[PDB]
Amino acid sequence: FRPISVFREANEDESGFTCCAFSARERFLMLGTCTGQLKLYNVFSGQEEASYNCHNSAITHLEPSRDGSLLLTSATWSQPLSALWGMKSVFDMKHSFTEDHYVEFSKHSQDRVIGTKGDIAHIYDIQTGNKLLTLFNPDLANNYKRNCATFNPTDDLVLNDGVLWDVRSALAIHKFDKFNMNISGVFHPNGLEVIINTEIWDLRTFHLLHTVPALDQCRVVFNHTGTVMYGAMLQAKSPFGSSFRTFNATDYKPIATIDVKRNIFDLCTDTKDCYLAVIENQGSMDALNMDTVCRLYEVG
Numbered sequence: 001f002r003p004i005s006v007f008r009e010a011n012e013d014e015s016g017f018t019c020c021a022f023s024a025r026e027r028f029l030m031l032g033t034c035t036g037q038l039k040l041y042n043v044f045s046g047q048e049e050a051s052y053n054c055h056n057s058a059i060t061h062l063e064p065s066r067d068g069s070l071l072l073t074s075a076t077w078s079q080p081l082s083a084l085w086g087m088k089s090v091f092d093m094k095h096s097f098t099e100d101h102y103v104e105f106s107k108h109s110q111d112r113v114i115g116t117k118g119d120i121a122h123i124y125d126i127q128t129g130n131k132l133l134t135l136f137n138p139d140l141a142n143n144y145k146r147n148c149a150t151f152n153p154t155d156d157l158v159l160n161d162g163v164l165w166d167v168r169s170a171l172a173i174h175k176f177d178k179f180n181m182n183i184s185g186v187f188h189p190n191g192l193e194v195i196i197n198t199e200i201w202d203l204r205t206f207h208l209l210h211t212v213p214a215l216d217q218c219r220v221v222f223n224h225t226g227t228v229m230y231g232a233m234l235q236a237k238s239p240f241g242s243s244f245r246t247f248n249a250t251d252y253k254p255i256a257t258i259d260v261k262r263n264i265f266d267l268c269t270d271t272k273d274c275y276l277a278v279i280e281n282q283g284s285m286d287a288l289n290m291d292t293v294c295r296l297y298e299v300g
């Protein structure tokens, strides 16, 4: 991990980056802010290139479509809470997800959005904005406090609140046992494994393949090649602490623990997996304003 760049939000007494994701274009990071702005930055110079007010509360999440034409945002305390924006020609809102605190694109063909509202998953059509499905079963719910519903790599399975759903049949296939209070889990990019906190489950057998203690209370993200998995741990103002963990995605063997000594808001990689961008808070929770920086590392 060689530090390559650092910048803060342009012209602010206090810097309000809350989340990031690379665009299509390679040198250009997208960042959310505590004032609900979406901003485009040159990741090397720290130059602010553009600015849009998406919400009147802080941004928690953003996701660009692979084709560069669409963006998902989620906010903290806004109605609507999440939205889908078009980025071809004119930046404009296409649809809004009134009470979904989290949204993602479908993964194989990006024609759908999945939203989370507490313990409930919603799937929408991107073209119409219509709600196609509601995935919830009160008898099977885990009530994870940081539930985030997600599609698998082929878009035909969903994980919501520790329940595996078949999308075609809208049937719950399997409820995974509850072993923690917060983390609901993600699919491995290989399409065969599910990672729920410290447990790695085989999707074909539901056997336990690995325990990874260092993953406790981590939000897990994969690089674009699916070779490396990155975790930041929930704190006991940011949702994360000051360290991130990397693991070999194939054998789950720890690669590195990096303590940046500042609470982390987000991290992401470019599509070529050369760079890791981390949002780090220089201020404490108790500060009047936030004071985040975006730090860019070359991976080593």
Ligand SMILES: CC(=O)N1CCN(c2ccc3c(NCCN)nc(C4(c5ccc(Cl)cc5)CCCCC4)nc3c2)CC1
Binding pocket: 025, 028, 038, 039, 040, 049, 050, 051, 052, 087, 088, 089, 090, 091
């Ligand atoms: C030299 C070079 O490659 N560059 C040089 C700098 N670039 C720039 C410079 C200005 C941009 C701009 N503003 C021009 C007038 N509002 N708008 C947008 C769009 C946009 C994206 C995000 C946000 Cl938050 C607000 C607007 C995305 C594409 C079309 C719809 C607006 N993208 C730009 C990219 C990116 C790449």
Ligand SMILES: CC(=O)N1CCN(c2ccc3c(NCCN)nc(C4(c5ccc(Cl)cc5)CCCCC4)nc3c2)CC1
Binding pocket: 018, 019, 020, 034, 058, 059, 060, 061, 062, 074, 076, 101, 102, 146, 148, 182, 183, 217, 218, 219, 234, 237, 238, 239, 265, 266, 267
């Ligand atoms: C009140 C306020 O202004 N703030 C300032 C803004 N805060 C922030 C800033 C960054 C966040 C973040 N980044 C990483 C992803 N982009 N992820 C998440 C979510 C999250 C958190 C923990 C876990 Cl295990 C699972 C999910 C995931 C996205 C939606 C909501 C919960 N929450 C954030 C809230 C919340 C408090």
